[PDB]
Amino acid sequence: QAEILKADAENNRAYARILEAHAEILKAQ
Amino acid sequence: QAEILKADAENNRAYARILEAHAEILKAQ
Amino acid sequence: QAEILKADAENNRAYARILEAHAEILKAQ
Amino acid sequence: QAEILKADAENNRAYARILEAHAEILKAQ
Amino acid sequence: QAEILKADAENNRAYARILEAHAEILKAQ
Amino acid sequence: QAEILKADAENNRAYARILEAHAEILKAQ
Amino acid sequence: QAEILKADAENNRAYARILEAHAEILKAQ
Amino acid sequence: QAEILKADAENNRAYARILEAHAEILKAQ
Amino acid sequence: QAEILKADAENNRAYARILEAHAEILKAQ
Amino acid sequence: QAEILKADAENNRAYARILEAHAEILKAQ
Amino acid sequence: QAEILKADAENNRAYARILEAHAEILKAQ
Amino acid sequence: QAEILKADAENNRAYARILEAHAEILKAQ
Amino acid sequence: QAEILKADAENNRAYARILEAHAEILKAQ
Amino acid sequence: QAEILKADAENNRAYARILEAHAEILKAQ
Amino acid sequence: QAEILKADAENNRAYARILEAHAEILKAQ
Amino acid sequence: QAEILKADAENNRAYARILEAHAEILKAQ
Amino acid sequence: QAEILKADAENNRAYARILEAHAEILKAQ
Amino acid sequence: QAEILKADAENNRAYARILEAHAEILKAQ
Amino acid sequence: QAEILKADAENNRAYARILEAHAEILKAQ
Amino acid sequence: QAEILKADAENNRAYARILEAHAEILKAQ
Amino acid sequence: QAEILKADAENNRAYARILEAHAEILKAQ
Amino acid sequence: QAEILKADAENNRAYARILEAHAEILKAQ
Amino acid sequence: QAEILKADAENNRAYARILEAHAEILKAQ
Amino acid sequence: QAEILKADAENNRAYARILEAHAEILKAQ
Amino acid sequence: QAEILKADAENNRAYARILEAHAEILKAQ
Amino acid sequence: QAEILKADAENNRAYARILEAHAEILKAQ
Amino acid sequence: QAEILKADAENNRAYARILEAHAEILKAQ
Amino acid sequence: QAEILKADAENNRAYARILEAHAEILKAQ
Amino acid sequence: QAEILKADAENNRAYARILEAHAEILKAQ
Amino acid sequence: QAEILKADAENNRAYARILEAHAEILKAQ
Amino acid sequence: QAEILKADAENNRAYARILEAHAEILKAQ
Amino acid sequence: QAEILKADAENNRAYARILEAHAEILKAQ
Amino acid sequence: QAEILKADAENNRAYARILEAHAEILKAQ
Amino acid sequence: QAEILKADAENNRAYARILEAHAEILKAQ
Amino acid sequence: QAEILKADAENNRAYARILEAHAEILKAQ
Amino acid sequence: QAEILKADAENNRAYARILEAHAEILKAQ
Amino acid sequence: QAEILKADAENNRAYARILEAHAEILKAQ
Amino acid sequence: QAEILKADAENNRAYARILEAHAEILKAQ
Amino acid sequence: QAEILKADAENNRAYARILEAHAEILKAQ
Amino acid sequence: QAEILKADAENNRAYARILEAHAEILKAQ
Structure with missing residues (x-):
């Protein structure tokens, strides 16, 4: 179990x- | 137990x- | 006990x- | 005791x- | 004692x- | 004493x- | 004394x- | 499993x- | 599998x- | 496969x- | 009973x- | 029952x- | 039911x- | 339903x- | 639906x- | 849709x- | 579209x- | 386009x- | 274009x- | 052009x- | 009409x- | 009209x- | 107009x- | 105009x- | 003008x- | 001017x- | 000037x- | 001057x- | 001077x- | 002097x- | 005059x- | 004068x- | 004078x- | 004086x- | 003096x- | 003294x- | 002393x- | 002593x- | 001792x- | 001992x- x-x-x-990598991609733009 | x-x-x-990573993604947009 | x-x-x-992460997701939208 | x-x-x-997290979820909507 | x-x-x-958290839940709705 | x-x-x-929390619950409804 | x-x-x-809290409960109903 | x-x-x-490499590319620009 | x-x-x-090499190229410029 | x-x-x-050689060329300048 | x-x-x-809320509405006008 | x-x-x-919210709206005007 | x-x-x-949000808008003016 | x-x-x-955001805008002025 | x-x-x-961002802009001034 | x-x-x-970046600019001053 | x-x-x-870079410049001063 | x-x-x-490089210059001082 | x-x-x-080289100079001091 | x-x-x-060579000189001291 | x-x-x-604000001013004195 | x-x-x-702010000033004293 | x-x-x-800031100053004392 | x-x-x-910063200073004491 | x-x-x-920095100093103590 | x-x-x-650095010093203690 | x-x-x-270096020293302890 | x-x-x-070197020493321990 | x-x-x-060499010694352990 | x-x-x-040689010795182990 | x-x-x-504050003190007892 | x-x-x-603070103390008991 | x-x-x-802090202490109990 | x-x-x-911190402690319980 | x-x-x-840290501990539970 | x-x-x-670290531990859970 | x-x-x-490291462990999970 | x-x-x-290394392990996953 | x-x-x-080497292994993947 | x-x-x-050699192998891929 x-x-x-x-x-x-x-x-x-x-x-x-x-998902955090996606957020960092969106923030770096 | x-x-x-x-x-x-x-x-x-x-x-x-x-879920917090999702929230960060939504905030970085 | x-x-x-x-x-x-x-x-x-x-x-x-x-639940707080859900609330943060809803607030970041 | x-x-x-x-x-x-x-x-x-x-x-x-x-319960407070539930209230925050309902307020953030 | x-x-x-x-x-x-x-x-x-x-x-x-x-109980106050319940009241806040009911108020946030 | x-x-x-x-x-x-x-x-x-x-x-x-x-009791005041109960009253607030009843008022928030 | x-x-x-x-x-x-x-x-x-x-x-x-x-008692005042009881009265407030009865009034909020 | x-x-x-x-x-x-x-x-x-x-x-x-x-994805992190993509974010670094976007940040280095 | x-x-x-x-x-x-x-x-x-x-x-x-x-991609990291691309990022390093962009950073070295 | x-x-x-x-x-x-x-x-x-x-x-x-x-690409890393390109980056080194750009850095050595 | x-x-x-x-x-x-x-x-x-x-x-x-x-009814008291109705009275308050009428008084606030 | x-x-x-x-x-x-x-x-x-x-x-x-x-109704109380209506009264508060009318009072705040 | x-x-x-x-x-x-x-x-x-x-x-x-x-309605309470409307009242707060009217009060903040 | x-x-x-x-x-x-x-x-x-x-x-x-x-509407609450509108009220906060009006209050912050 | x-x-x-x-x-x-x-x-x-x-x-x-x-709108909340507008309110924060007005408050930070 | x-x-x-x-x-x-x-x-x-x-x-x-x-707008939040504008607010942060105004706050950092 | x-x-x-x-x-x-x-x-x-x-x-x-x-704008965030401007805010960071103003904060670092 | x-x-x-x-x-x-x-x-x-x-x-x-x-601008971020300017901010880092100001911070390193 | x-x-x-x-x-x-x-x-x-x-x-x-x-500018980043200037910042590194200031930091190394 | x-x-x-x-x-x-x-x-x-x-x-x-x-400038980076200057920074390295200052760091090696 | x-x-x-x-x-x-x-x-x-x-x-x-x-006028009520005037009355409150006079009462708070 | x-x-x-x-x-x-x-x-x-x-x-x-x-005027209400004036009243609050007078009350806080 | x-x-x-x-x-x-x-x-x-x-x-x-x-004026509200003045009132808050007087209240915080 | x-x-x-x-x-x-x-x-x-x-x-x-x-003034609000003054009030916060007085409150933090 | x-x-x-x-x-x-x-x-x-x-x-x-x-002044806000002063308030934060007083609060951190 | x-x-x-x-x-x-x-x-x-x-x-x-x-002053903010002083506050951070006091907070880190 | x-x-x-x-x-x-x-x-x-x-x-x-x-001062920030002092704060970092105190935090690292 | x-x-x-x-x-x-x-x-x-x-x-x-x-001082930063002292902080790094304390952190590496 | x-x-x-x-x-x-x-x-x-x-x-x-x-001191940085001391920190590196402590980190390499 | x-x-x-x-x-x-x-x-x-x-x-x-x-000291750096000591650190390299400790790292090579 | x-x-x-x-x-x-x-x-x-x-x-x-x-005097009204005195009366309220006497009433709250 | x-x-x-x-x-x-x-x-x-x-x-x-x-005196009003005294009255509130007596009422909260 | x-x-x-x-x-x-x-x-x-x-x-x-x-005194108001005392009243709040008594009320929070 | x-x-x-x-x-x-x-x-x-x-x-x-x-005292306010005591009140907050009592309220958070 | x-x-x-x-x-x-x-x-x-x-x-x-x-005391505020105690209150935060009690609230986070 | x-x-x-x-x-x-x-x-x-x-x-x-x-105590604040304890509160953060309790909050992160 | x-x-x-x-x-x-x-x-x-x-x-x-x-304790802060424990909190970070609990948060990273 | x-x-x-x-x-x-x-x-x-x-x-x-x-413990911080454990936290970094958990975060890198 | x-x-x-x-x-x-x-x-x-x-x-x-x-443990840090384990974290680096997990991050490099 | x-x-x-x-x-x-x-x-x-x-x-x-x-383990660090394993991490370098994974990074070089």
């Missing part, structure tokens, strides 16, 4: 990193 | 990070 | 963080 | 934080 | 905070 | 705060 | 505050 | 690196 | 390197 | 080397 | 609040 | 809030 | 919020 | 936000 | 953001 | 960003 | 970046 | 870079 | 490089 | 190199 | 607000 | 705001 | 803001 | 900002 | 910034 | 920067 | 840099 | 560099 | 270099 | 070189 | 305010 | 404020 | 602020 | 700040 | 900061 | 920093 | 740094 | 560095 | 270096 | 070097 929740959290953090 | 609640809290924090 | 109430409080704070 | 009342107060404050 | 009345007052204040 | 009356007054004020 | 009458007056004022 | 989620996270991080 | 995701990640990293 | 992605990555790295 | 009379009193108080 | 009277009271209070 | 009365109350509260 | 009333309430809250 | 009301609410929130 | 409202919202957010 | 609104948003973001 | 707006955005970003 | 705007952007970036 | 702007950019980059 | 009487009533209410 | 009466009402409300 | 009354109202609101 | 009234309003707002 | 009022407003804003 | 007011504003901003 | 005010501003900025 | 203020600024910047 | 201040600045920069 | 400060600076730079 | 009678009236109103 | 009566009125208003 | 009455008024206002 | 009354007012304001 | 009152005010402000 | 009060204030500020 | 209070403040700041 | 408190502070800073 | 605390700090710094 | 902690630190630094 926890071994899947940790992976889900890691994937969510990766998607959050992608 | 606590070992599952900690993982649930971590996943909730990851989702909150995703 | 207290070891479960602390975890419940932490989960409630995580959900409150998620 | 007090060690349980303090935890109850902390949980009540966490729930109040959740 | 006083050590219990102080805790009771703190719990009552926490419940009052919850 | 006074050390108990002060605590009783504080608890009464906390209950009055709870 | 006066040190007890002052505390009695303070407790009476706290009870009056509770 | 985890062996696929790790790869998905790695690909998401690579895409985030691409 | 993973043998293709690793190659996709490597290609994404190569493209990110190209 | 992978035998083509590896070659594509190598060509992308060669182009990145060319 | 009393559980219905209390609700009837509450509804009557709500209607009285509506 | 009471579950409908409570809702009727809540709707009456909402209409009273609307 | 109640599921419609709650929505009606929420819409009435939203309209009351609009 | 409720799925339309919720959207109507959200639009009313958005218009109330616009 | 709802797919258009959501977009209308988003546009209203964007206009409210513009 | 929605494909135009989204673009209008994005342009409104960009103009709001410009 | 959208292909022009996106460019307008990008130009507005560039002007906002210029 | 877009081929000119992109160039205008690039020139605006270059001027923003100049 | 674009062939002149690109050159103007390049000259602006060169001047920004000069 | 461009044949002169390119030379101006090259001279500006040479002066920036001189 | 009514379109002029409404405006006359609004102006009368504005003058009444001015 | 109405276009002048609205402006007169707005000016009267502004003067009423000035 | 209206173009002058609007400016007069804006100046009156600015003076009211000055 | 309006070009002078706007400047007068801006100067009044600047003086109001100074 | 306006060219002097703008400078006066800028100086007033600078003095307001100084 | 303006050439002296600009310098006065710049000196005031420098002093405000010094 | 301005040739001395610029030097005074530069010295004030240098002292502000010293 | 300026020939001494420039040297004073340079010495202040050198001392600020020393 | 300046011939001594330059030497003092050089010695301060040498000491800053020593 | 300067003939001794130059030697002191040279010795400080030699000690800084020793 | 009138310039003294107005001041006498203002002082009488201030004393009346003091 | 008037310059002393104004000060007397201001002191009387300050004492009235003190 | 007035220079002492102003100070007396300021001290009275400070004491009134202390 | 005034130099002591100003200090007394400042100390009274500091004590009022302490 | 004043040299001790200033220190007393500073210590009172530090204690107020501690 | 003052040399001890300054140290007491610094220690109080350090404890306030610890 | 002061030589021990300074060390106590430094240790408190180190513990505050640890 | 101080020779042990300094070592305790250094160990606390090392643990804070470890 | 100190001879063991220094070694503990060095080991903690080595572990922090390992 | 220390003779083992030094070896443990050296091994940790070697592993950190391995």
Whole structure:
């Protein structure tokens, strides 16, 4: 159970990193 | 019990990070 | 007893963080 | 006795934080 | 005696905070 | 004697705060 | 003597505050 | 399951690196 | 599946390197 | 499939080397 | 019996609040 | 029965809030 | 029945919020 | 029915936000 | 129907953001 | 319809960003 | 239509970046 | 049309870079 | 038109490089 | 026109190199 | 006819607000 | 006719705001 | 005519803001 | 005429900002 | 005339910034 | 006249920067 | 006159840099 | 006069560099 | 005077270099 | 005086070189 | 003559305010 | 004469404020 | 004379602020 | 005389700040 | 005398900061 | 005397920093 | 005395740094 | 005493560095 | 005692270096 | 004891070097 929740959290953090990169792209313009 | 609640809290924090990244994207526009 | 109430409080704070992120998303629009 | 009342107060404050986040969500709309 | 009345007052204040959050939710709608 | 009356007054004020929060909830509706 | 009458007056004022909160609850309905 | 989620996270991080490079390009202009 | 995701990640990293080189070109000007 | 992605990555790295050489030329001026 | 009379009193108080709001509207003109 | 009277009271209070807002509009002019 | 009365109350509260905003606009002038 | 009333309430809250922004503009002058 | 009301609410929130920025400009002077 | 409202919202957010930058300029003075 | 609104948003973001740079200049003094 | 707006955005970003360099000069003093 | 705007952007970036070198000189002191 | 702007950019980059050498001298001390 | 009487009533209410402000000034002294 | 009466009402409300500010000054002393 | 009354109202609101700032100064003491 | 009234309003707002800063100084003590 | 009022407003804003810095100093203690 | 007011504003901003640095020192303790 | 005010501003900025370095020292502890 | 203020600024910047090095030492621990 | 201040600045920069080397030693551990 | 400060600076730079060599030793491990 | 009678009236109103505050103190007990 | 009566009125208003604060203290109990 | 009455008024206002803070403490309980 | 009354007012304001912080503590519970 | 009152005010402000931090802790729960 | 009060204030500020860090920990959850 | 209070403040700041690192860990999740 | 408190502070800073590295790991994901 | 605390700090710094290397690995992906 | 902690630190630094080499491999791709 926890071994899947940790992976889900890691994937969510990766998607959050992608979104933050999008925000930085929009801010640098 | 606590070992599952900690993982649930971590996943909730990851989702909150995703939502905050969405908010930053919307603000940078 | 207290070891479960602390975890419940932490989960409630995580959900409150998620809701505050939703509010920030709605405000940034 | 007090060690349980303090935890109850902390949980009540966490729930109040959740409700205040709901109010902020409704106000930001 | 006083050590219990102080805790009771703190719990009552926490419940009052919850109720005030409910009132703010109802007002923000 | 006074050390108990002060605590009783504080608890009464906390209950009055709870009741005022109830009144604010009823008014915000 | 006066040190007890002052505390009695303070407790009476706290009870009056509770009653006024009840009146405000009844009026807000 | 985890062996696929790790790869998905790695690909998401690579895409985030691409987006961060885009942001750096836009900032250096 | 993973043998293709690793190659996709490597290609994404190569493209990110190209973009970072573009950013360095723009910064050196 | 992978035998083509590896070659594509190598060509992308060669182009990145060319771009980095351009950046070094611009910096040395 | 009393559980219905209390609700009837509450509804009557709500209607009285509506009428008092009408009176305040007429007075503010 | 009471579950409908409570809702009727809540709707009456909402209409009273609307009327009080009208009165405040007329007073602020 | 109640599921419609709650929505009606929420819409009435939203309209009351609009009217209160109008009153605040008129007062700030 | 409720799925339309919720959207109507959200639009009313958005218009109330616009009006409150107008009031803040008038107050800041 | 709802797919258009959501977009209308988003546009209203964007206009409210513009107005709040105007208010902040007027306040910073 | 929605494909135009989204673009209008994005342009409104960009103009709001410009206005917020003006406010920050006025505040930094 | 959208292909022009996106460019307008990008130009507005560039002007906002210029204004934010002006604000940073004024703040660093 | 877009081929000119992109160039205008690039020139605006270059001027923003100049202004940010001015701000960094003022901050380093 | 674009062939002149690109050159103007390049000259602006060169001047920004000069200013950044000035800032680095001031920081290294 | 461009044949002169390119030379101006090259001279500006040479002066920036001189200034960066000054900064390195000041840092090495 | 009514379109002029409404405006006359609004102006009368504005003058009444001015007079009430005068009364509040005299009372606060 | 109405276009002048609205402006007169707005000016009267502004003067009423000035007078209310005077009253608040006198009360805060 | 209206173009002058609007400016007069804006100046009156600015003076009211000055007076409210005076009142806040007197209250904070 | 309006070009002078706007400047007068801006100067009044600047003086109001100074007074509000004085009030904040007095409150922070 | 306006060219002097703008400078006066800028100086007033600078003095307001100084006063706000004083307030922040007093608050941080 | 303006050439002296600009310098006065710049000196005031420098002093405000010094005061803000003092505030940051006091806050970091 | 301005040739001395610029030097005074530069010295004030240098002292502000010293104070900010002190603040960073206190924060890093 | 300026020939001494420039040297004073340079010495202040050198001392600020020393303090920043102290801060970096404390942070690296 | 300046011939001594330059030497003092050089010695301060040498000491800053020593401190930065200490920081690098602490970071490399 | 300067003939001794130059030697002191040279010795400080030699000690800084020793410390940097220590840092490189620690990093290469 | 009138310039003294107005001041006498203002002082009488201030004393009346003091007496009304005394009455409110006696009523709140 | 008037310059002393104004000060007397201001002191009387300050004492009235003190008495009103006493009344509020007694009411809040 | 007035220079002492102003100070007396300021001290009275400070004491009134202390008393109002006491009242707020009693109300928040 | 005034130099002591100003200090007394400042100390009274500091004590009022302490009491307001106590009130905020009691309210946040 | 004043040299001790200033220190007393500073210590009172530090204690107020501690109490405000306690209030923020209680609010964040 | 003052040399001890300054140290007491610094220690109080350090404890306030610890408490603010606790509050930030509770908020980030 | 002061030589021990300074060390106590430094240790408190180190513990505050640890707590802030904990807060950053919780926020990055 | 101080020779042990300094070592305790250094160990606390090392643990804070470890925690900050953990936070950076969580952020880079 | 100190001879063991220094070694503990060095080991903690080595572990922090390992964690920072992990963070850099995760960022480079 | 220390003779083992030094070896443990050296091994940790070697592993950190391995991890940094992995990071460089991932970055060079």
